[PDB]
Scaffold this active site. Sequence first.
Site, PDB file in Angstrom:
ATOM      1  N   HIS A  92      -5.131   2.558   0.844  1.00 40.03           N
ATOM      2  CA  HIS A  92      -4.162   3.461   0.040  1.00 40.03           C
ATOM      3  C   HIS A  92      -4.353   3.187  -1.481  1.00 40.03           C
ATOM      4  O   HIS A  92      -4.410   2.123  -1.650  1.00 40.03           O
ATOM      5  CB  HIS A  92      -3.015   3.702   0.674  1.00 40.03           C
ATOM      6  CG  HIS A  92      -2.720   3.945   1.811  1.00 40.03           C
ATOM      7  ND1 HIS A  92      -2.957   2.772   2.952  1.00 40.03           N
ATOM      8  CD2 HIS A  92      -2.493   5.093   2.687  1.00 40.03           C
ATOM      9  CE1 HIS A  92      -3.002   3.139   4.192  1.00 40.03           C
ATOM     10  NE2 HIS A  92      -2.689   4.646   4.056  1.00 40.03           N
ATOM     11  N   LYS A 138      -9.655   5.589   7.428  1.00 39.87           N
ATOM     12  CA  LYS A 138      -8.875   6.479   6.684  1.00 39.87           C
ATOM     13  C   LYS A 138      -8.801   5.862   5.354  1.00 39.87           C
ATOM     14  O   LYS A 138      -8.455   4.665   5.185  1.00 39.87           O
ATOM     15  CB  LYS A 138      -7.397   6.478   7.380  1.00 39.87           C
ATOM     16  CG  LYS A 138      -6.387   7.194   6.694  1.00 39.87           C
ATOM     17  CD  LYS A 138      -5.084   7.201   7.330  1.00 39.87           C
ATOM     18  CE  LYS A 138      -4.077   7.744   6.257  1.00 39.87           C
ATOM     19  NZ  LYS A 138      -3.945   6.791   5.241  1.00 39.87           N
ATOM     20  N   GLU A 155       0.709  -1.310  -0.087  1.00 43.55           N
ATOM     21  CA  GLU A 155       0.055   0.025  -0.058  1.00 43.55           C
ATOM     22  C   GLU A 155       0.761   1.389   0.181  1.00 43.55           C
ATOM     23  O   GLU A 155       0.340   2.294   0.591  1.00 43.55           O
ATOM     24  CB  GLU A 155      -0.881  -0.035   1.182  1.00 43.55           C
ATOM     25  CG  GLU A 155      -1.918  -1.243   0.926  1.00 43.55           C
ATOM     26  CD  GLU A 155      -3.248  -0.859   1.619  1.00 43.55           C
ATOM     27  OE1 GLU A 155      -3.749   0.266   2.052  1.00 43.55           O
ATOM     28  OE2 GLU A 155      -3.991  -1.892   1.589  1.00 43.55           O
TER      29      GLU A 155
HETATM   30  O1  LIG Z   1      -0.716  11.684   4.316  1.00 44.60           O
HETATM   31  C1  LIG Z   1      -0.464  10.673   3.823  1.00 44.60           C
HETATM   32  O2  LIG Z   1      -0.983  10.552   2.549  1.00 44.60           O
HETATM   33  C2  LIG Z   1      -0.043   9.286   4.540  1.00 44.60           C
HETATM   34  O3  LIG Z   1       0.178   8.325   3.301  1.00 44.60           O
HETATM   35  C3  LIG Z   1       1.073   9.440   5.207  1.00 44.60           C
HETATM   36  C4  LIG Z   1       1.538   8.159   5.997  1.00 44.60           C
HETATM   37  O4  LIG Z   1       2.687   8.386   6.808  1.00 44.60           O
HETATM   38  C5  LIG Z   1       0.114   7.505   6.742  1.00 44.60           C
HETATM   39  O5  LIG Z   1       0.508   6.435   7.120  1.00 44.60           O
HETATM   40  C6  LIG Z   1      -1.154   7.473   6.054  1.00 44.60           C
HETATM   41  O6  LIG Z   1      -2.156   7.397   6.840  1.00 44.60           O
HETATM   42  C7  LIG Z   1      -1.385   8.981   5.093  1.00 44.60           C
HETATM   43  O7  LIG Z   1      -2.444   8.446   4.205  1.00 44.60           O
END
Ligand SMILES: O=C(O)[C@@]1(O)C[C@@H](O)[C@H](O)[C@@H](O)[C@@H]1O
Lengths: 252, 252
Positions: B143, B170, B86
């Site tokens: 993600h 998230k 991811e």
């Molecule tokens: O700010 C982001 O896009 C992040 O990928 C940064 C990452 O360090 C975090 O684990 C994630 O939750 C965010 O989406």
Amino acid sequence: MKTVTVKNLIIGEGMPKIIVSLMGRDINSVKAEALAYREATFDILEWRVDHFMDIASTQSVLTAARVIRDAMPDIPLLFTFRSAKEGGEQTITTQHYLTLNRAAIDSGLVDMIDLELFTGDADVKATVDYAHAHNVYVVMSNHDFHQTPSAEEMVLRLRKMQALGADIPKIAVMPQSKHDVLTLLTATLEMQQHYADRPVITMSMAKEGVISRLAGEVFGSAATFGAVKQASAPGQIAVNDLRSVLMILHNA
Amino acid sequence: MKTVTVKNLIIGEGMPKIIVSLMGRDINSVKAEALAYREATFDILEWRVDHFMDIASTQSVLTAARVIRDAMPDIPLLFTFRSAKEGGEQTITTQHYLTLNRAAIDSGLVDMIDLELFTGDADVKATVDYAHAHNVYVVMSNHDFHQTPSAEEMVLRLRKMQALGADIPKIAVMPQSKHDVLTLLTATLEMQQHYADRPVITMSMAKEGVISRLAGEVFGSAATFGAVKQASAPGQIAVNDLRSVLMILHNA
Ligand SMILES: O=C(O)[C@@]1(O)C[C@@H](O)[C@H](O)[C@@H](O)[C@@H]1O
Ligand SMILES: O=C(O)[C@@]1(O)C[C@@H](O)[C@H](O)[C@@H](O)[C@@H]1O
Ligand SMILES: [Cl-]
Ligand code: NA
Ligand code: NA
Ligand code: NA
Ligand code: NA
Ligand code: NA
Ligand code: NA
Ligand code: NA
């Protein structure tokens, strides 16, 4: 994209340009505001002529415009009589509206005038032509202070302004919901991507719409209004805060 | 809305909370980052475990977690192994991912853990239950570093996270157009206004998506990532600039 360059300011490139409105009710207040605004930082000064309470006299109006020009010789100056029909402070006849704008145009005191799209097609075309004959740019405007039209209707209006010769189409609409703010951003982007012949100014008003005043660089609004002291429409924020956010977005 | 409160920080109301990520390879580098971060202002510390070298040893990982916990005893601490699956920095087996997260949970060293939705249902359900039994909150994450799914698909994913017991769903997606940024905002707003009963975090990545990191208070994202010095994902901006914009929007 046909950009508009006014006193070295290129509208339609880079960061959205910051407009502030001067709203004095009488000549003494206009004089005071013109002097006080010199130290604020912004790109374009709009004189909200409909807030001036001696619009009965063309001499009084032109003298006020001259005072503003005297105080700020190098600032792009936009002359705006916002009609009562579209949310302005007082009702005047159509012929009075057109006479004030023609006098502003041929005075040489202003760089730009605001002309409302739905004033009437023949009168709009005649006034656009007169502005252009005297090297004045036209911000052509439409407002909905009650609701947000569909994205497709907003695009229709902005395209009509282009068809009528506007240098800078402008639309301001009132959100009833956060969803309505996205509708306004969607319409803005549709212009940027598909009908990008000139700079356009868009905004969703009120508190819910504030993000639209900040995100112009992303979605394609060429200018945005801030408040020096008092807001000239719901949702405007302090001009220095506006500038701070625009710079952060520009440089991100 | 039912909020999530960690160490006096209320996630899900007021201004979006600022998360910064710590990314060192070893104990000394983690210590140096934690020390440097003393000069920064933020709400939540995320340890990006996938940036650590010795992830093979559960002891090494817990020793580092303890160093971080003891360096910043009063900050909400989020443990995140972002799988290369991811967008993370290295691969991990699902079983070892399970081991590290369970060990972090039952050690008492972390307040929150990130758990990837697509890890597999049995593992997700078991790990959610383990977290909750130990008074640890779950940020359940997804993600897409390549593209932006439809709003419908994103809302269903956020709803699925809620159904699986996420304390904070998230999603982070990569725009390939400005339209894609609006799609992410649309999904965020739909989720928040129609289906969410807890805080949700969303973002559109990269420069194009920056507005999504700024407008959480408007469209319904409860937290946002900033960069102290190095970004942990594309599009994060400097943490002081992030805070400046959040405060201006909050007070508009
Ligand atoms: O700010 C982001 O896009 C992040 O990928 C940064 C990452 O360090 C975090 O684990 C994630 O939750 C965010 O989406
Ligand atoms: O910022 C706005 O919403 C304005 O209504 C302010 C007003 O003074 C300007 O004439 C108008 O162009 C803006 O749309
Ligand atoms: Cl004339
Ligand atoms: Na006018
Ligand atoms: Na009128
Ligand atoms: Na003339
Ligand atoms: Na580092
Ligand atoms: Na993790
Ligand atoms: Na246990
Ligand atoms: Na705990």
